[PDB]
């Protein structure tokens, strides 16, 4: 199937293992920004559910299907590929919704569905939006979608902006510089200094920060889930040209994302922006091994490139330069292996 061609079998096992735990479903569920926003999106656009057929891609606990049920949908196919599907079935029973919500265990790429749906709902966003490659499952699922049928979320906006944070830079630099010691218990480690800097700076930083660290208006990359093919996410190219608003060292790019539920009644946005209340996605920073010096008024230009890989993530390359000086930074990041720094 499309899924296992995409995916190292190994990766799929571990992935679905992780979503198999109740503690992890709890962790997502108790993110009130996320859970309440989805509920508002669905409930406020009740006409998009009233007596409709619905697909929930990766239903987890079933929470989103329960919302679709609360909004008066006729039938909801709740597809889930982890063992969490058992637990979801328990809940559908204990909530007396066996006549409206149908758990269909299995990957959405592989299972059969009795009929075409009026709408698809999912929560498939990872860190930096694209981690996990679940967006490709969500797009794949449009083979069950009726003409002029809807997606929830409908569109996703990835934002990127240059930042300055010397404390963060130094924290990672100091770790790498363990491997610059010439006499650790008498041993010269220093020949590995370069390899160490590479490895540490490969890890994106997941945490939050104050908007004051940002040095330029963000650039936006949009994905329209109505229109996109899942192959569109194999190679994600994001050119950028930042007009710098402050002088200082640029230590990297910061990333966040928004999604919009474009309902028949209203649009509702879920934002992981650093200006917005905290979510379990935090924000993501990709540090440059050597920061770039910039003057207010300069342009910082280049490209962020995400290459999808078989471990359900992306190899990121970020090439940036300060046009006024030709000062350049090229970086390769491993999105699967972030440094969770928070607290």
């Amino acid at each position: 199937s499309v899924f296992s061609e995409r995916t190292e079998e190994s990766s799929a096992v571990q992935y679905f293992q992780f979503y198999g735990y109740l503690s992890q479903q709890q962790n997502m569920m108790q993110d009130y920004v996320r859970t309440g926003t989805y509920q508002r999106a669905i409930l406020q656009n009740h006409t998009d559910f009233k007596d409709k057929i619905v697909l929930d891609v990766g239903c987890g606990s079933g929470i989103l299907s329960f919302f679709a049920a609360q909004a008066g949908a006729r039938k909801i196919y709740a597809v889930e590929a982890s063992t969490m599907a058992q637990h979801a079935e328990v809940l559908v029973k204990s909530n007396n919704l066996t006549d409206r919500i149908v758990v269909i265990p299995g990957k959405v790429e592989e299972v059969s569905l009795p009929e075409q749906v009026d709408i698809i709902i999912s929560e498939p966003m990872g860190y930096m939006l694209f981690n996990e490659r679940m967006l490709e499952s969500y797009l794949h699922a449009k083979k069950y979608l009726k003409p002029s049928g809807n997606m929830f979320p409908t569109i996703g906006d990835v934002h990127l902006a240059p930042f300055t944070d010397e404390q963060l830079y130094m924290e990672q630099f100091t770790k790498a510089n363990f491997w610059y010691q010439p006499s650790f218990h008498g041993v010269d480690l220093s020949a590995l200094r370069g390899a160490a800097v590479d490895e540490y700076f490969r890890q994106p930083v997941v945490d939050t920060f104050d908007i004051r660290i940002l040095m330029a208006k963000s650039v936006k990359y949009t994905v329209n889930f109505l229109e996109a093919k899942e192959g569109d996410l194999h190679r994600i190219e994001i050119p950028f040209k930042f007009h710098m608003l402050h002088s200082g060292l640029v230590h990297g790019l910061a990333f966040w994302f928004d999604v919009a539920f474009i309902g028949s009644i209203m649009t509702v946005w879920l934002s992981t922006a650093p200006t917005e209340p905290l979510t379990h996605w935090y924000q993501v920073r990709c540090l440059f091994q050597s920061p770039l010096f910039a003057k207010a008024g300069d342009t910082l230009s280049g490209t962020c490139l995400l290459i999808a890989n078989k471990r359900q993530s992306y190899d990121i390359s970020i090439v940036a330069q300060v046009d006024q000086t030709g000062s350049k930074s090229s970086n390769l990041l491993d999105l699967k292996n972030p440094f969770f720094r928070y607290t």
Partner: peptide, 8 residues
């Protein structure tokens, strides 16, 4: 990845 969504 190893821990695709982490704690809030």
């Amino acid at each position: 990845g190893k821990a695709p969504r982490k704690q809030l």
